Design a protein around this ligand. Structure first.
Ligand SMILES: [K+]
Ligand SMILES: [K+]
Ligand SMILES: [K+]
Ligand SMILES: [K+]
Ligand SMILES: [Mg+2]
Ligand SMILES: [Mg+2]
Ligand SMILES: [Mg+2]
Ligand SMILES: [Mg+2]
Ligand SMILES: [Mg+2]
Ligand SMILES: [Mg+2]
Ligand SMILES: [Mg+2]
Ligand SMILES: [Mg+2]
Ligand SMILES: [Mg+2]
Ligand SMILES: [Mg+2]
Ligand SMILES: [Mg+2]
Ligand SMILES: [Mg+2]
Ligand SMILES: [Mg+2]
Ligand SMILES: [Mg+2]
Ligand SMILES: [Mg+2]
Ligand SMILES: [Mg+2]
Ligand SMILES: [Mg+2]
Ligand SMILES: [Mg+2]
Ligand SMILES: [Mg+2]
Ligand SMILES: [Mg+2]
Ligand SMILES: [Mg+2]
Ligand SMILES: [Mg+2]
Ligand SMILES: [Mg+2]
Ligand SMILES: [Mg+2]
Ligand SMILES: [Mg+2]
Ligand SMILES: [Mg+2]
Ligand SMILES: [Mg+2]
Ligand SMILES: [Mg+2]
Ligand SMILES: [Mg+2]
Ligand code: NA
Ligand code: NA
Ligand code: NA
Ligand code: NA
Lengths: 63, 92
RNA sequence: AAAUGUAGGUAUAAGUAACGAUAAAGGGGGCGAGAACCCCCCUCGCCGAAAGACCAAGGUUUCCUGAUCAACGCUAAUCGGAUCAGGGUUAGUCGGGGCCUAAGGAUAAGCCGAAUGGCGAUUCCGAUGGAAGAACCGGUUAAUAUUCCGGUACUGAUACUGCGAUGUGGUGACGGAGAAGUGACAGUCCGGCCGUCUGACGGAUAGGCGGUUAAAGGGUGUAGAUGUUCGGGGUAGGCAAUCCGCCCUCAGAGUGCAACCUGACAGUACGGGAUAAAGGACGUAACCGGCUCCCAAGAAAACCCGCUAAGUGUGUUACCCGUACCGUAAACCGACACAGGUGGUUGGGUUGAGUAUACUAAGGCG
RNA sequence: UAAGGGCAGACGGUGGAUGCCUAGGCUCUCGGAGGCGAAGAAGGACGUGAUAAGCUGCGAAAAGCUGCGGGAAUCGGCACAUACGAAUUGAUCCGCAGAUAUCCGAAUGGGGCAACCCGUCAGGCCCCUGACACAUGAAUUCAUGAGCGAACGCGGGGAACUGAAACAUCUCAUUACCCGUAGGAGAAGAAAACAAAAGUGAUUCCCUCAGUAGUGGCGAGCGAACGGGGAUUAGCCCAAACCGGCUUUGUGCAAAGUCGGGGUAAUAGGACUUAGAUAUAGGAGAACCUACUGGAAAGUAUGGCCGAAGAGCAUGAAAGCUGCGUAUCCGACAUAUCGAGCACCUGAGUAGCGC
């Protein structure tokens, strides 16, 4: 994704995408260890996107 | 992040070739057996029947420069998982 | 230019001392550029109450495998406890820990004291001890195995088919020495059964060789042992010390012996088979937390059972840490691959009083 | 003649001196500041990468996440290679404000051999696992403290070697060192003071006075003040007499306590009769050609030009005009900082005294 499209999501849906992102991220790491992926750069991108969702969800509650 | 990676080694391939329900993963060193059974069952959607564990400290890798620059690999835990008799798992 | 002056480098003695127990080596093959030393085989030799096997402390990857021989190895090295990479440690019961307390330590209320602080419970911590929760035999890997697999067991929780502590009792709960009787395992001998072979020289189809196995748990109550003996405390109670009605050890504890047992090892033959491969004679404290004698008179608390005050069946399930390897040593303490030191268990056969001594198996070494 | 040896030279080996150089030190000047921590510190453990020993950064959101300001083509740390990606819809990078922030450690729920083990309580999932709270001590549930860390300050304790050419008084020294506890400074500070008929008026610090007056087994030693010249300058508040109220106590009175008024001396006195600036990112910023030597000009020789810029560093040699800069000028969304009389009062186990 990208930061602009993440904030467009509503609060109920953002948590739905979060668990989907964490679930798919563990499979990719397992998949990468079994046999290297075509694009290793998707591991960093997925991991740093999860930190973006946790940041915005925190902002909604905190602010 | 319980499961780190599966184990593909000569010993484990032979173990699976005898017990078709027997698999082995690397997991976080501080996870207990109850948690590990939950993770392997919430990700591969199977019936785990038994889990055995062992803790490995990392191998020391002492290099030399002007001497004795110590190094070490991270510690890990090994989980040997037995599925319900008649179930399998595909690492591809 | 000199201080038995300091650092770094390089000489001399010198191709000299020495190469770390006088247990010992010889030959044939192999890989290889290269072999006294590495691998395989035949012979020889050493240890064998150990120089074999299993733990603890300590060490911390030295364990297994591939590649490498620069450095390390008191020689060389194709080898290594060396370098690099990969791999390898699996527990409801084992050892810890979770529970309990000892020495001691830290404290509470208090006490003492220029400061820093020193003392001080029945409190807590603290094993080298106590636990009422419980497993043993076999087999498999290059490397793990009461942990994996097989067989046969056991112990907590949990779901479905009046209770009684924080007080106070009982238990737990304890020395040294001595021998005897009963009688397993191991071991030896005799004798059958199963398989296999016919061994340089004189003799032997009568012999040689390998086998013929077993634990925990369960049962019996056998050998043997011990027992015929109305006030003093724990249960009917009020905060342990001036009472009265009530059920007993007449049975306890216990080897050996059944069963577990139609497992297993070696060797032949091809996961399966021979193979469900008789029995004796000794020997034999593993009964025994027993018995007898003595004076030096032989922990604590908890678990587990009381009392009042206050108020069977089935299924599921059993978390944590250790587990490789060395360990009378080349891996621990000694600057060393050092003739030293290092707690516990086991330790076959013949000889013997013996765990002494000599020679040997398994296993380990030159 | 030379098994060998001697001396000289030539060329080498070894070793790492010397010359040249710098990436790090040393001593200071000027300005600022002088703490961090229970909202969990200093210091650590363990982790964190496509790849990942070690450092660095970071904390399960883990070489990093979100805004605002800046800036403009590269970037994914030291740091390579290979591999995959990000970015002119503005990546990386810089300034500011936020988010996250495991375990130990004052460590604070109880224990403990630091980085571990074991709980009660309320919630939610399912033998386990989340996410709260739960130390002690001094004040009134609440507020506070604890610990760490340069020097300088103030307190409590306090040596010896050494000198005296021995040594005990004395010296070293109210030092070293140990302990307690502040602040940006601290301590001191507004006369029960000095002086000597002449005067100065709080404290602190510098120059003199002065190695003087003194002190001292009158030994070794120790050692002022007054006065003068400077820096800087600053002064105030209570208690009491007496009056009022209120509470308490003894018995309307009186005493104490507590707030209000009165009052503060030395010639004695008193009562009564600021919003702009600065700091932490940034923007602009002049001016050179030909020839020779050379591997390479910035050198040398001509001829130009700029200068509020001829400081410097780098660039294949020594550059005002090649680059980064320099002189000068201009800039902040944040955040940080800047009358008579009268005798009533004027501090008590205190001044003074013996040991
Ligand atoms: K090899
Ligand atoms: K048999
Ligand atoms: K604690
Ligand atoms: K007053
Ligand atoms: Mg199991
Ligand atoms: Mg384990
Ligand atoms: Mg000498
Ligand atoms: Mg000689
Ligand atoms: Mg000689
Ligand atoms: Mg010698
Ligand atoms: Mg010799
Ligand atoms: Mg030798
Ligand atoms: Mg031995
Ligand atoms: Mg080896
Ligand atoms: Mg050699
Ligand atoms: Mg090796
Ligand atoms: Mg146990
Ligand atoms: Mg205790
Ligand atoms: Mg082994
Ligand atoms: Mg076994
Ligand atoms: Mg107790
Ligand atoms: Mg072992
Ligand atoms: Mg040797
Ligand atoms: Mg001894
Ligand atoms: Mg013995
Ligand atoms: Mg013997
Ligand atoms: Mg002997
Ligand atoms: Mg020379
Ligand atoms: Mg030099
Ligand atoms: Mg921006
Ligand atoms: Mg003297
Ligand atoms: Mg302070
Ligand atoms: Mg001042
Ligand atoms: Na029995
Ligand atoms: Na000659
Ligand atoms: Na988190
Ligand atoms: Na600029």
């Amino acid at each position: 994704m990208k930061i602009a499209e993440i904030k467009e999501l509503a609060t109920k849906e953002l948590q739905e995408r979060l668990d989907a992102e964490v679930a798919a991220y563990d499979q990719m790491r397992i998949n990468h260890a079994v046999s290297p992926l075509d694009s290793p750069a998707k591991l960093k991108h997925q991991r740093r996107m999860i930190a973006q969702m946790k940041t915005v969800l925190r902002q909604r509650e905190l602010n | 992040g319980i499961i780190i990676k599966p184990i593909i080694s000569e010993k484990m391939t032979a173990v699976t070739e005898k017990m078709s329900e027997r698999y082995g993963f690397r997991v976080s060193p501080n996870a207990n057996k109850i948690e590990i059974k939950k993770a392997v069952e919430a990700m591969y959607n199977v019936k785990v029947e038994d889990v055995n564990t062992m803790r490995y400290d990392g191998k020391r890798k002492n290099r030399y420069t002007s001497g004795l620059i110590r190094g070490k690999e991270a510690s890990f835990k090994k989980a040997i998982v037995t599925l319900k008799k008649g179930e399998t798992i595909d690492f591809f």
